[PDB]
Every structure is written in structure tokens, then in C-alpha cells.
Amino acid sequence: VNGGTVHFKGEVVNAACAVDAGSVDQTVQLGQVRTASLAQEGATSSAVGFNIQLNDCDTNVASKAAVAFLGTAIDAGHTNVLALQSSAAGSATNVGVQILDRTGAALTLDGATFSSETTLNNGTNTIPFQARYFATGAATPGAANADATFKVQYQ
Amino acid sequence: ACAVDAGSVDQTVQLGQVRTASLAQEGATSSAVGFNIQLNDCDTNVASKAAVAFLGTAIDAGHTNVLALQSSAAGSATNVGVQILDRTGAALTLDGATFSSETTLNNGTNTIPFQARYFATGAATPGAANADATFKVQYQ
Amino acid sequence: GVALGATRVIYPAGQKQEQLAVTNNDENSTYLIQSWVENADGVKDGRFIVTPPLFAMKGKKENTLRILDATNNQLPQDRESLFWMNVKAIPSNTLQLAIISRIKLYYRPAKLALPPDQAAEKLRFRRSANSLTLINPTPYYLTVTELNAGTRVLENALVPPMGESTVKLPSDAGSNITYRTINDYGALTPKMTGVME
Amino acid sequence: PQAFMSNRARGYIPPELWDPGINAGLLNYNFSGNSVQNRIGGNSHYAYLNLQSGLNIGAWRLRDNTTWSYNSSKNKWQHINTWLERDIIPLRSRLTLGDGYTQGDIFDGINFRGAQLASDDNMLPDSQRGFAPVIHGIARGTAQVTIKQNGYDIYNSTVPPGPFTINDIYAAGNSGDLQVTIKEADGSTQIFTVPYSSVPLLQREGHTRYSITAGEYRSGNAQQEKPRFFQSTLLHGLPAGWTIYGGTQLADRYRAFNFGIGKNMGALGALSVDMTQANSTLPDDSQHDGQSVRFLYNKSLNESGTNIQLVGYRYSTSGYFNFADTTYSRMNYNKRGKLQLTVTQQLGRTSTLYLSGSHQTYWGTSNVDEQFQAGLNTAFEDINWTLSYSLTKNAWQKGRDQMLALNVNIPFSHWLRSDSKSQWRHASASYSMSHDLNGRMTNLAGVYGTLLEDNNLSYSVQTGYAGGNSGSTGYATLNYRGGYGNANIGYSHSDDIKQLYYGVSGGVLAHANGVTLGQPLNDTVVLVKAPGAKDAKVENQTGVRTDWRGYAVLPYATEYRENRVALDTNTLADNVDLDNAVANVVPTRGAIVRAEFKARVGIKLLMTLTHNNKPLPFGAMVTSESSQSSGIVADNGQVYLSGMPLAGKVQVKWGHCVANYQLPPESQQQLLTQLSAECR
């Protein structure tokens, strides 16, 4: 007519954020290079926008994560310009891609991280970035696809 | 009559490790973990049917069918509790008088199965979830 | 995009193989996972070996990285040691993005003078002009967040064990200091006040 | 528009991914034995063996139950239940042939033997379960909707410029105030709130549950007969918070029709009223017609999440009998009214006062069966205490019949430090004191916990004292949950009684790849097959280890859900490396699903390969046909290989090179070996 007690013991573990960059395969499309427009070093191209979503995680762990970009610099002077990674007939000359910030300031590719400042969009936490071409003297009609590395320090 | 089996008086159930991805929003539940309550010497003539009722602290009035995890020195998880299902798969109210589904008492040993589950009321913070419940048995 | 099981992996001394879960939530995504361990200076090191180093993940799948020890008991047994575990997801005219998730690997000696619970409280503050130094006598790495000097946050600090970390403080901030350190599992400890000792 | 789009619910699994299982046998045994030694009657031995056989061939699941009893004086094998079950995916239903029970909620629970086809709710995604309002709306322009609870957000998504219906809202407890907020790109945000109150008889809009049962009636009592009967049950969720539930219970002598409606009034609460009209032929030739009404009310959260009230009234007019009264013997006082009032009040965020009152009056017999229950459970830090009171004044002169109980649970972690390595951390002290309001005291103080590395061996030593008689009843128990079975042994000592309990429970699977032993099974089971990986503990389960052949069985797996099965890489032989340490299986109801793991038994090797004194390029594939192994070069020519012989050769395909290598026995004994081998 009477019984005892049952106790339940378990652990709830925090999970790291899942990073989604732009479209599938972490790919962001860029407009084709304009040979006439990419004349001088200061010449630029269309600043195509994209975003990185830190989904499947809490809005606190996502917000506390530091963020950085890195890659291969094309030249000593062009620290912020990513070297194009292409070994074919489609390699272009004196071209590269720049990863900009929200405002439009250049982002260092050395690895110096900065606060994410994630915007809490209805879905999840998001950080927007932009990419644009940066000529360095000359232009060539070739597909100047590049490769960059995203670093997220989960504090 | 009969009584609860020796050893089933005080029982411990290891739910395991669950992640905020599994419990991120209100109503999300983890994988059920089975556990049984055993009765010995229950004869058909003395008591045909029996059922149990669990008595435990509710995390909030709104969710009276789920438990409240106890605070710990290291740190207790927030907005998550323990929910006790049944053979039919429905939740059990943690009130003393609300009993479970009836069962047929076979002569001798009789095992009644139940499931323990994690129930998240909102976003779940990481930590250790430990909960207690007291169960009483009514024979018919 | 790949995800790690926890944002903080604590490896106790004396074990051989820690485990860390890697998962792929996206159903249609082919990935190449490359994992390694660097010291506290961001230098690739062989003291911890993550196996398999590079492997291919197809679709929605979960694997387990085994962190094998090779310290040979050459690390100090007095205080915790810090390492950085980096997991990179190569997504094998367009620029591709490879994500490097970096987590903290705490090599924790088996026997310590103080339990982890009391480490957070014993964190004193040395206040001076344009400085809010945090002194941590406890032998644990303290992850101080939401460092409020009255009405303003300073930044997120990582105070080493038995060390004094430095933080720049604007003079307009008030005397009152409130903080909260991230615990073992990754949650936020309730907001404590700060003593001036 | 989203409404026209076939948007799937959250956590939806296609029926094709569901695993029927494997064609395999099943045998669950539970042997128990009691040695009772009393000074008056010497010693006696009792034995009870419960054997549950089964066969899962194709999709059909045959199950059979048998009991064997022994006293110390004869053997009597007694069948109990046999049933052949199956799941019909197109009908979203479950079919059962043979013995079974009626899960009827509108009607009373009935045990039978026949055919039952009943819709199953577990097959539905977890999101579309229970009761939750479905949001219908028209969004002008592409908008973003955030249906948010009183506390936090629930459903955030994007909606096209058209009609949209959202039915993925979770149950979210009994009561909820869902604020639907749509935000258009151009127009100002549009918000509206909907409250709801759920009742177990309420169903979601456009949701149907049905149950068709036919066959003989089976009951434990020998007096009751075995008439054939039919039972139809239907539960439909109409739009706008209405639910229509009907039922028909037909037999030779009993014919009943139940009709009822349930309503979700929102802030007011939830209501459910049903009338059952029944014509029954009693055991005597007299025929009785009757109607019974079951009114049920659920009030929403009063104050601010403090009080919840449930009022269940049942009026059974004279001449209303259930099926049992009809099915009584050839020759063998009705309930004029029943009232259940339950009030739960939460206070101090820790104490939960539960008050319950049952009040049943009969026809003729004016005596009322009053039953009052009051529970007060509080959880102050680790301390967990409970004070309960009961008062039962029934018709058959039960008197006052009061009872008081006090239970305190104090874990030892309250005093032990957080990082303590002592086994005492997984221990607690339970103190119970019961009074019968007459001087009868029942004290019981005990320690309990687990004392094994995997926390399998659960121990419990509780002494006691029953005083009117003054008997100090000690009680010791040890349960062990190993990888082969559960073994429990206990010693119950009294003033003149010594009881020794000893039992073993286990499960046996005669699958295609030999016989596998393990813990007692529970409906669905997962057969983890990792040949060559001996004694490898599985994850998130206690005491479930692979046998010497590498086959183990998981006691429980959630049906029609994505569950993870992981092998603990920490407690695994250093000579073995798994290609995949985690698998996912979606089992059907009562299905044996194989989670296959590939394990390499050779030594673990890290090879630095250089071609023409140059490291091999990134992404190069290094295979070895000698032991069937593969790997990918990471950097600097470092490649990982699992399951490799002592002396061998590997092939490298950067875009065809061979690398020979030899290893010493000390290298073979090393955990992970590192060697450098120049390639051709």
C-alpha cells in the first residue's frame, strides 16, 4: 500500500555553435571581374554581402565567441587582400578579394580576433560580412576564386 | 497482501548526458530511459489490479507533470526537469492521488515499466540535473 | 556546418584518451575534418594527438575525436594547464570558407588543493588608475565575463592560475565591481561582487 | 504560400527511413527466489520463473508469456498472454491479433482476446503530439513570424505573402499564452495573443484517433464469463478548439453509445462533457437502461502561475452499468455520483501543495466515500522533504482512517566536496516516519547509492522500527546490472523472520550471427554488433558491455525516433580502433535493429611519408590491401592508419606509390606508434 523513492541523475552539457557561412559548401558568389574597371590599386568592384549564422546553440555561447578571419596574403603591402588561389588558365593577374566589416573597414587576415557582436535575428545569431575585388595594378579575364579560413574561439 | 520488491524501494536512474540542441525550446524532450518497479508475492485473489502514483515537486505550477531538479554546489541546470511517462506513453501528474494505468497482477513476481525523460521549459542551461520522487502503490 | 560537443574539454591527469564529439547537422554537406592541438602560445604541438587527424564526413553524421596523451608526465602537477584544440572543416568564381572552431583544453592535475566550486569566489581585484587587475590565487583558469565596473563592461578576461591579469579601465567607471565566471559545463555562475583585496 | 507548400513538421522522419528490424528470436527470463526462515515454521523456499518468448520475423512480432512456480512442491507451466502485433504505416496504425487490453479512455479498461486495430500517436513527430493551438493567418507581403510563449520564443520562421498555417507548436504544458507576432518587411508589426488550456481528451485540429476492437472478453476473475464483444472509439479534432469523441461498445447483452464534446475556452479553461447511453442485460433476466454524464473542467493558471484546479463530476443515473456488470456470472448499488476536486498550489518556488478530494455517493446507500489527500513536497538545496496526510471515510465503516507520512532525502554530496573521489559521493540518507493517527509508528532510516565504476552495483541498507509490537526490521539489498544480466540479492531481517531474496533477469537474442546475452529487454532493442571489439562499454547506458564476440543488446530505444548509439572510446582496448564510434538507428515498435560498427584490430600507426624527399600532398589517399585499411594524408606527409600488421606495405594515390615499413614489438605494444617511411 506504500512505496519508496526513485531518483533521477543526469548531466546537461552545453554544445558548441554550428557555423553556417553564406550558401551551401560555405560558398559565397562574387561578380565577375571587370578588366576596364579594375585599373588602379584603389579600383574596387561590387561589395557583395553575405552572413555567417551561429545556429543550434544558445544566444549566450554564440555571443561570447570571438571571431577572426585568416588566409594567405598576396603581398606584404596588401595585408588585407586575400591572394587568389587558382592554378589554371583561369588565373588572373594583380587581383584579389577583400573581406570587409559591417561598416566597410578592412579586416586583417593575420588572425587578430575581435568580438562577434552577433545580431539576434529571429532565427539565430548572425554576423554579416562583405567581399569585394581589389585590383593591385592590372586586370586579366580569369576566374579569380580564393579561399579564406574562419576562426571562432569559443570562450 | 504483497509489497514492493526488495531493492526497488530506493532506486536510482541515470538519464545520461543531453545537449541544449536536443533541449533548446519549451516542450523539447530527450530520449526516454526505462526503469521498472517490482512487486513480489502479489496473488490474484488478494489483489487483482494495482497502480502507482508519483509525488514530487513541480518545477512550476504551469508544468505540474514534470519534476524540479535540486540545486547543487557545482551548479544546477535551469529551465529543465524530469518527466515520468507510462506504458501508454502519457505523462503522469505528480499529485499523490492521481494514479497511473491499471495492470493485471500475475501470480508471483510482477514488474511495472516506466520511462524517465527530460522536459525543457524554455532554453536549457547546462549543468547537473538531479530530481527525486516518491511513489505509492494501490492494490485493487 | 560542423559542431563540437562542448565548448570546454577538461582532460584529467592520468587518463590516456579523452573523447570529443563532432557532428554535422546539415543533411547534404560533405566535409573534411582536420583537428589538432596547440599550446597556450598558439603553436602547433605534439603533446596531445587527436585521432583521426584528418577524415571525411559525408552527410549528417557524428564522429568521436580521441585526444591521446603524450605528455609523459612532463607537465606541472600543481596548477591547471591550458591548450587550444582547433577543428577545421574544409567544405570539399567563388571564395570558399573553412571554419576553424577553437576550444579550451584544460589539462587538470588529478589532485588539487581547492575544489572547482570555490575557485570562482576567490578572485580579488587590484584597482588603480586605468587598470583593474584581477588576481586569482586559486589554481584554476578563471573565465571572467560581464566585468561590470559600476555601469560599464570592460571585456572578457581569462585569468591564469596563481596569476594577475590586466584590464584597461576608463576612469569614469564606478567603484562597484560585479562579475560572473563560466563554470565547468559552460553555464554562467550567478553574478558575484568583487572585493578590492 | 506556406499553407499550400507541404511544409513538414519539426523533427519529421520519413516512413522510409524507419527500420523494420531483423528476423530474430527473443527470450527474456526473470528468475526469483525467496528463502523465508521463521522460528515457528523452519524454512521455506519459493521460486518464480517468468519466461517471455518472442519471434520477430518480417514485420510481425509474436510474443508469448509464461510463468513457472515452485514451493518447498510441483511444476505448473502457465501461459498468460500471446499476441501477434504489426504496424501498418499507410494507416498510421497498429494491429494486434490475440490477447491484449483495450486502451479505452472514453470507456473503461477491458482485457480481451481478439483483433485490435488502433491508431498510434508515437508514429507522429514529437512536435505534433498532445494539444496545441494551430495558428492560421494571412500575411500581406513576405513576413517573419515569431510565435513566442510568455517566457521565451517558440516558433520563428519566414512566411510568404499568402495564407499560412502553423501546427508545429509543442504541447508546452497544460496552459500557455502564445503571442503570435508577424513582422512585415514594409508594414508595421502585427501581434495577437491566443491562450489555451489542454485536456487529455482534446485533440489537435485535423487529428484523428480511432480504435476497432473485436473478440472475446477475458478477465482474471473466474466468476465472470467470456462473451464476444466489439468496441469502436473515435477522437477527432475539429477547428476552433473543438473535439468530438464517440464510442460504441456492443455485445450479446450490453449495448452502449458514448458521445462527447470538448472545448478549449482559452483564458477560462478547458471543458469536456460526454454522455453514455447503455442498455444492459443484468446477470438476471432483467434489462436496465441508463445514461451517465462525465463533466470535466480544467481551470487555467490562477493568480500568476500559482493555482491549478481540476473538477471531475460524474452522474450515473439508476440503471447504468459498465460491461463488467453485464459479464458477471449467470447469477451474481450503483454510483449515484462521483466528484473529484484537485487543487495544486506552488509556493516559495520550492513547495508544492497538492490537495485532492474524492466524494462518491451511491443509490440507496446514503454512505459517502470521502477521500482527502494533502501533500506538501519541498526541495531546499539537496534536502528533499515531503509531508503527506490522507483521510478516508468510506461506505463500509472505514472510520476516520487517517495517515501521516514524513520522508526526508539527504544526499551525501551536501557534505562531500564537488571533486571528491570517494565512493560515498553517490550516496544518500533516507528517513521516513509514518503515523496511523492511533499510535502506530513506522520509522525507517537507510543509506542507499551505487558503488561501482559504472554505477551498476546499487546498494541499499535500511533499518527500521515498527511500533504499535516493537519490531526492528532491517533490510539490505544489492542489485547488479552487468552486461549479461541483472542479479539482485537481499536480506530482510525481522524480530523472528529472515527472508533471503535472490534473482536473475536476462535477455537472449538468437539473431543470425549467433546467440547474444544481455540485460532484460524492453519492447524495442538495439543490437550493437562490433566484432573484434571485446568488452567495449556503450554510452549513456549503465552496465551494457559487449561480450567476447562483440555483440551486445541495448535494453531500451525510443520508437520512431532518432536515437544515438555510441561506443565509449575511453574504455576500449588500445589495440582496436573504430571507423565510426557513433551510429543512428530509427527502430519500429518492438523491432530488433542492428547498429553495425566496423572495428580494426591491428595497431594504430602514424606514418610520415616523403616522396623524392618531399612530403606527400594534402588529400592523398593511403590504402593498405594487406589488412584492408585506408586513410587521408593530413599535412607534412602525416597519415593515420588503423588496423595494420607489424611489417607491411601501403599504397599512396595522390592523383601510385608504394611504401614499405617494419615495426618492433615494443612499437606493437605502444599505444600509438609513429614511424617515417620514404615512399617509392
Residue numbers in the entry:
A (entry chain A): 5 to 159
B (entry chain B): 20 to 159
C (entry chain C): 1 to 92, 101 to 205
D (entry chain D): 116 to 187, 194 to 453, 478 to 613, 617 to 803, 809 to 833
Task: Give the authors' words.
Uropathogenic Escherichia coli strains use filamentous type 1 pili to adhere to and invade uroepithelial cells. The pilus consists of a flexible tip fibrillum, formed by the adhesin FimH and the subunits FimG and FimF. The pilus rod is a helical assembly of up to 3000 copies of the main subunit FimA, terminated by a single copy of the subunit FimI that anchors the rod to the assembly platform FimD in the outer membrane. The assembly platform FimD in the outer membrane of uropathogenic E. coli is the catalyst of type 1 pilus assembly.
The assembly conditions were further optimized to produce a sample with an average pilus length suitable for cryo-EM, allowing us to determine the overall structure of the FimDHGFAnC complex to 4.1 Å resolution. However, the rod was initially not well-resolved due to its flexible connection between subunit FimAn-1 occupying the pore and FimAn-2 emerging from the pore. Multi-body refinement in RELION-5.033,34 further enhanced the resolutions, yielding 3.6 Å for the pilus rod (body 1) and 3.9 Å for the assembly platform (body 2). By combining the maps of the two bodies, we constructed a composite map that includes both the assembly platform and pilus rod, which sits at an approximately 51° angle on top of the usher. On the periplasmic side of FimD, the FimAn-FimC complex is bound to the CTDs, while the preceding subunit, FimAn-1, occupies the pore of the usher. The NTD is unoccupied and not well-resolved. Multi-body refinement provided insights into the movement of the pilus rod relative to the assembly platform. Although restrained by the rim of the β-barrel and the extracellular loops of FimD, principal component analysis revealed a twisting motion of up to 11°, as well as side-to-side and back-and-forth motions of up to 19° and 18°, respectively. Multi-body analysis indicates that the connection between FimAn-1 and FimAn-2 serves as the main pivot point for pilus rod motion relative to the usher.
